[PDB]
Structure formats: structure tokens, C-alpha cells
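Long-time lurker, first post. I've been practising inverse folding by hand and with some scripts of my own, and I keep getting stuck on stretches where the C-alpha cells seem ambiguous. Below is the full C-alpha cell string for one chain I'm working on. Before anyone asks, I'm not after the true native sequence, just a reasonable design that respects the backbone. If someone could post their per-position residues I'd love to compare against what I wrote down in my notebook.
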């Protein structure tokens, strides 16, 4: 029985060093109720992950480094490679960036209701209480991620997205079609990683919208307490 939770994680290249503290924080804060089984789906090129030889929930998946911009553009194309084992092993899906870190215990409060659409979005830390006129949406009608001015509620970031497995997999398949449709039209959506997810969140507003506290950049001073910290990529330790 219990509730199955799946974590989508990509750390190809030099971002594999972010897995250690992320895993140690997820095992201490993220879903530690007795009704939660947590599964790690790590997409990397590293031959072995941290605590992989001890933990069985850590699924090392073959994935080379695609570089820019395919590492953020073809992100959802990677998730569909194992979409056959995702719905059978998980009930909820969650995507976190590499350099993310848990600081506060996260429970069932971020779980979308059973009646709603079952989607999850996170407000961008750079756009809090800023007007719609300052949103960096895709303003080209030729692209599939096009959002006209005046429309939209929040500016969702691509650093953190989730929801139930059934609704989240449809989200991935929808965007993948939007990427390939733009590839044929010789056009690249901007910003590809977050503009595409805002177009979907406009057509399909998420059940619950997380504050930028779950995407708090390290060093900033934002009007909320940091729950999930975006670690600085340019630190001497990294
Ligand atoms: O070589 C790379 C570059 C990026 N990422 C992933 O892409 C996400 C966003 O990275 P970002 O675009 O901020 O890095 P940049 O492309 O600016 O170097 C992160 O969660 C990384 O895990 C990756 O796996 N390998
Ligand atoms: C790198 C990051 O956190 N993402 C975005 C970046 O892509 C760009 O949209 C910028 C200005 O809108 O806001 C952030 O820095």
C-alpha cells in the first residue's frame, strides 16, 4: 500500500556533485512520513551515484550531456524514456534542479487534491508581487509557448514542478510536442525551460502554487523564509 513518491533528477556533466547533499536533505526533510515511499530517478552520465550501493530507491539512469540548450529544452523528452515504469512505481512526480537543497521538513501539504487537476507550479523568485507587464513570457505568436500580454496570473519557474503521475506525464508529453513543433518551424521558445511550462500552466492552472520559498536563491533577501535553497553554482567547494 502506502503512497509512492518519485523524484525526477538530472545531473549530467559537472552537476553530479550536487546529488550528495540533495539526497541527504531529501532523506531528512522531504516526505518522511510512514505513509511515504520515496523514489529517486537520477538522469546522469556518472558511473555511480552517492549511496547508490546502499539504497535501492536510487535509480541510476543512462544519460549523456546534451549541453546548451538541449539540457533544459529536451528535459521532458528524457522523462518519457521511462514513462512506462513511472506510472507503475510512483503515484506522484516531482522535479528538482541539481543545486537545490532542503532546509525545512516538507510533508503532505504539497500534495495536490484527488479531485483537482493534480498539477503543481512554483512562482519565480525574481517576480514576486510584480505586475503582469514585467513577465518574460514568449511574445512570439509563431511559437507554441506564446502568451499575449495581459494574460497569465503568476510567472512559474521550471526549477520545480510536480503533481500526480497521471497529470504530470500528460504535461511532459504536451510540451515535448510543443518543442518538436517549434523545431520544425525553425523557432526556439524563450525562455525554453520556463516559458513552455507557463503556456501549459495558463491552459491548465496548477492545483496548488508554491511560493518562491521552494526556489529561494542563496544569497538573496526575499520576503519569506527559505524552505528549499538554490545553491550558488560558483562556490569554491563546487
Ligand atoms: O550540463 C548540465 C547543465 C544543466 N543541467 C541541469 O539543468 C538544470 C538547470 O541548469 P541551468 O540552466 O541553471 O544551468 P546553465 O545551463 O545555466 O549552466 C539543472 O537542474 C541541472 O541539473 C545538467 O544536468 N547538466
Ligand atoms: C537562471 C535563472 O534563475 N533563471 C532565470 C533566467 O532564465 C532569466 O529568465 C532571468 C531573467 O528573467 O531570470 C532568472 O535568472
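-- Answer (accepted) --
I ran through it position by position. Result:
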Amino acid at each position: 500500500s502506502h503512497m509512492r513518491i518519485g523524484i525526477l533528477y538530472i545531473c549530467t556533466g559537472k552537476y553530479d556533485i550536487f546529488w550528495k547533499d540533495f539526497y541527504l536533505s531529501a532523506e531528512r526533510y522531504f516526505m518522511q512520513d510512514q505513509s511515504f515511499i520515496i523514489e529517486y530517478y537520477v538522469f546522469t552520465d556518472s558511473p555511480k551515484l552517492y549511496d547508490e550501493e546502499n539504497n535501492k530507491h536510487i535509480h541510476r539512469i543512462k544519460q549523456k550531456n546534451l549541453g546548451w540548450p538541449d539540457n533544459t529544452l529536451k528535459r521532458f523528452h528524457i522523462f518519457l524514456r521511462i514513462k512506462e515504469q513511472l506510472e507503475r512505481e510512483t503515484d506522484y512526480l516531482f522535479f528538482f534542479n541539481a543545486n537545490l537543497l532542503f532546509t525545512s521538513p516538507i510533508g503532505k501539504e504539497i500534495l495536490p487534491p484527488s479531485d483537482s487537476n493534480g498539477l503543481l507550479g512554483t512562482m519565480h523568485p525574481g517576480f514576486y508581487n510584480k505586475p503582469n507587464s514585467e513577465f518574460t513570457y514568449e511574445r512570439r505568436d509563431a511559437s507554441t509557448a506564446y502568451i499575449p500580454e495581459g494574460e497569465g496570473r503568476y510567472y512559474y519557474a521550471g526549477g520545480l514542478s510536480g503533481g500526480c503521475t497521471k497529470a504530470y506525464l500528460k504535461l511532459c508529453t504536451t510540451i515535448c510536442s510543443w518543442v518538436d513543433r517549434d523545431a520544425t518551424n525553425h523557432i526556439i521558445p524563450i525562455w525554453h525551460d520556463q516559458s513552455l511550462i507557463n503556456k501549459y500552466f495558463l491552459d491548465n492552472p496548477p492545483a496548488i502554487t508554491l511560493s518562491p520559498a521552494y526556489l529561494y536563491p542563496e544569497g538573496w533577501l526575499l520576503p519569506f523564509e527559505p524552505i528549499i535553497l538554490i545553491r550558488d553554482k560558483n562556490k569554491p567547494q563546487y
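A couple of notes from the structure itself: The domain at 1-238 is CATH 3.90.550.10 (Spore Coat Polysaccharide Biosynthesis Protein SpsA; Chain A). The pocket of A2G (ligand 2) is lined by residues 126, 136, 191 (CB under 6 Å). Happy to go over any region you disagree with.
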